[PDB]
Design a protein around this ligand. Structure first.
Ligand code: 4Z0
Ligand code: MG
Ligand code: MG
Ligand code: MG
Length: 714
């Protein structure tokens, strides 16, 4: 082969070279000792990794059997819980405790604000995300539907002053609401000056300062005609840029050019569900971008530097110019042929990611080319997705411990952001947090995966409600509150993030600004956004809502019961007309085809995908988990027939084809369906859905993408 032999391992040359030539230099880790470490960590932890996966299977088979042996229609909750407890699904709740995680940066312990997630394989998107710490509110408002495109205010190819004035007014109101003047409104400001370390705002008839002078954080330029004024509210910065000579500032009563918001406080660079990586070449592309980010030298145009300000008293200071970076590794399930053992068996990808993303993150703890890019406190921040229960969390912590030894890092350098996105984690959440009590930096409700797991776990119980109905079911509302309750009780306030899920509708920003405010109102110190634009707009919510106060008020409250968590989303009798069935079938077949065709044919794992009604959605692979499981569930219980499925797939394929008309590399699925690997992948996900472990889509998706790549090689 072309592989490199290290003990029992056979490592793809492209990976071996990348690590030796690019990742290792500058870390002071002995290369041979690194590789011996890899061989040993893989040998030592692989058995437990497999035992945990087998345990998921044993539990699911027992639950499957429990539903099948019973006829009683209304589920008996006392019996169901007793059962789950007996088999070891539902574990006892540990005594109260406080997390001890230390050496964590302020962006995580203290600051409440948006968290942006992007595919690590797209260098330009990663770079924009890293730079998304600051973003223009005017661009965010003018460019989206937050300012309605009513008659007269529609966007054209050139600047619409009517629309621009609405942008300015929206922003002035935000200022009054966030950093109130002692008297009057920012709407009537004519200028800004700094006198005796105090901000002075000129009104037409008078002058005034801030109602709370402490919100004045600094300025740039001369105190008597500053070029910008820096404010702070709820720990987040706001910067008013002053330039009468700008095309917007010329129209403005105070010569204001823009309002800049501190937006994406943190960013998660994603190796999991938003990317498609199925071999050594794909992993290396990902690792190389992550390396470029940590070394500060990624260029696709470059990483931003820190921002210089004058303090109110007159001294100099600096604020970070970049989003603090997490990396999301893959979870415990999949293997990847980047490394195989002597028998030819692939190595667990989660173990590999911990070794390589962790090695690479060392560069972010030291000076670039510039000061160090990432954690000044010395932490490496890893998001670990798709864990099922406390023993899997413990396994991840032990993995991190062993990697830390290989890398010569102090124990607990590698912190864990826990995804609460599987049912067995949800109902044992307190124990999961406890298992990582000295490493945990967040918990986050990954509601898409969680919905997928909800369907698969109770697959045998009966037909589930429609996909759109899931977001409002009792189980999910309880799941969201239970998550917050568990974090706060474990002492997360002031120590770790309590996070909520992704807003997926990229073009519906008026809707986002209107509804996503629910999340910090529910005590979430962060929530996910898919773009820098959405980060800037979501930042508005944290100025409107005092998350610290909200969390304080929620303390000690127990707002969800175990019974509510366990309420299966079974459809009621006679729930749907025949037309409603068909629309749901088409909805899910279109969602599957729309996502799968980009994944299999182009190796794209997140993008703006039009849904059946042409709404642009940007969802990771979990959306595929939901739709394929729901259709498998309906097929399993006689709601629809295999002919209904095939008919819908055949109906939706040409539509998806049309939706991709603006794409040079696209190739249509219709009408030669059986010649399209993507179409066959979509079909396989549905018809084999019930048989996939926990409904996971990766085994089929990865195989099909590999098949596609191999065909393209001929
Ligand atoms: O809910 C889940 O299962 C989860 O992992 C978070 C979902 O995020 C996404 O949809 C993304 C869209 C773009 C980047 S991530
Ligand atoms: Mg997920
Ligand atoms: Mg329904
Ligand atoms: Mg306030």
């Amino acid at each position: 082969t072309d592989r490199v032999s290290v003990g029992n391992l056979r490592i793809a040359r492209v990976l071996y070279d990348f690590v030796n030539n690019e990742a290792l230099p500058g870390t002071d880790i002995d290369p041979d000792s690194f590789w011996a470490g890899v061989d040993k960590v893989v040998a030592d932890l692989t058995p437990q990794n497999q035992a945990l996966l087998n345990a998921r299977d044993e539990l699911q088979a027992q639950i499957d059997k429990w539903h099948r042996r019973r006829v009683i229609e209304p589920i008996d909750m006392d019996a169901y819980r007793q059962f789950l407890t007996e088999i070891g699904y539902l574990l006892p709740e540990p005594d109260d405790f406080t997390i001890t995680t230390s050496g964590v940066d302020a962006e995580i312990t203290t600051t409440a604000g948006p968290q942006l997630v992007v595919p690590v394989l797209n260098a330009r998107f990663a770079l924009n995300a890293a730079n998304a710490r600051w973003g223009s509110l005017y661009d965010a408002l003018y460019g989206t539907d937050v300012i309605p495109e009513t008659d007269g205010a529609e966007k054209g190819p050139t600047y619409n002053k009517v629309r621009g004035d609405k942008v300015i007014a929206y922003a002035r109101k935000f200022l009054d609401d966030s950093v109130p003047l002692s008297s009057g409104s920012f709407g009537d400001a004519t200028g800004f000056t700094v006198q005796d370390g105090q901000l002075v705002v000129a009104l037409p008839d008078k002058s005034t300062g801030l109602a709370n002078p402490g919100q004045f954080a600094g300025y740039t330029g001369a105190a008597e005609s500053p070029t910008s004024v820096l404010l702070i509210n709820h720990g987040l910065h706001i910067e008013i840029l002053i330039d009468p000579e700008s095309q917007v500032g010329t129209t403005d009563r105070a010569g204001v050019k823009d309002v800049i918001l501190e937006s994406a406080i943190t960013t998660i660079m994603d190796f999991e569900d938003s990317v498609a990586a199925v071999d050594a070449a794909d992993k290396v592309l990902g690792y190389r971008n992550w390396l470029g980010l940590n070394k500060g030298d990624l260029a696709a145009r470059v990483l931003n530097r820190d921002r210089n300000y004058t303090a109110p008293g007159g001294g100099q200071f600096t604020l970070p110019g970049r989003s603090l970076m997490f990396v999301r590794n893959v979870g415990h399930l999949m293997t990847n042929d980047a490394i195989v053992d002597t028998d030819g068996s692939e190595v667990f990808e989660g173990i590999m990611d911990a070794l390589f993303t962790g090695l690479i993150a060392i560069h972010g703890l030291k000076a670039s080319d510039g000061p160090l890019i990432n954690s000044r406190t010395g932490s490496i921040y890893i998001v670990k997705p798709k864990m099922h229960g406390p023993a899997e969390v413990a396994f991840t912590c032990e993995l991190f411990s062993r990697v830390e030894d290989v890398l010569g890092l102090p124990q607990n350098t590698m912190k864990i952001g826990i995804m609460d996105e599987e049912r067995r984690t949800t109902v044992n959440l307190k124990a999961c947090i406890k298992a990582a009590a000295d490493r945990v930096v967040f918990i986050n409700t990954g509601f898409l995966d969680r919905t997928g797991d909800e369907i698969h776990t109770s697959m045998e119980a009966g037909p589930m409600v429609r996909k759109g109905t899931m977001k409002s079911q009792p189980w999910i509302l309880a799941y969201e509150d239970h998550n917050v309750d568990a974090g706060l009780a474990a002492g997360f306030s002031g120590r770790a993030q309590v996070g909520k899920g992704m807003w997926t509708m990229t073009e519906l920003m008026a809707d986002m600004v209107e509804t996503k405010i629910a999340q910090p109102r529910a005590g979430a110190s962060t929530a996910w956004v898919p773009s820098p634009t959405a980060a800037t707009l979501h930042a508005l919510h944290y100025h409107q809502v005092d998350v610290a106060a909200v969390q304080q008020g929620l303390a000690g409250k127990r707002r969800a019961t175990i019974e509510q968590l366990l309420t299966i989303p079974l459809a009621k009798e006679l729930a749907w007309a025949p037309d409603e069935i068909r629309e749901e079938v088409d909805n899910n077949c279109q969602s599957i085809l729309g996502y799968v065709v980009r994944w299999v044919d182009q190796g794209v794992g997140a993008s703006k995908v039009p849904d059946i009604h042409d709404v642009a959605l940007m969802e990771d692979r979990a959306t595929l988990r939901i739709s394929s499981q729901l259709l498998a569930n309906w097929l399993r219980h006689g709601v629809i027939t295999s002919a209904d499925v095939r008919a819908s797939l055949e109906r939706m394929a040409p539509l998806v084809d049309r939706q991709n008309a603006g794409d040079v590399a696209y190739r249509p699925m219709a009408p030669n369906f059986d010649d399209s690997i993507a179409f066959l992948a979509a079909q396989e996900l549905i018809l084999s859905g019930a048989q996939q472990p926990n409904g996971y889509t990766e085994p089929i998706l990865h195989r099909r993408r590999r098949e596609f790549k191999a065909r393209a090689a001929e």
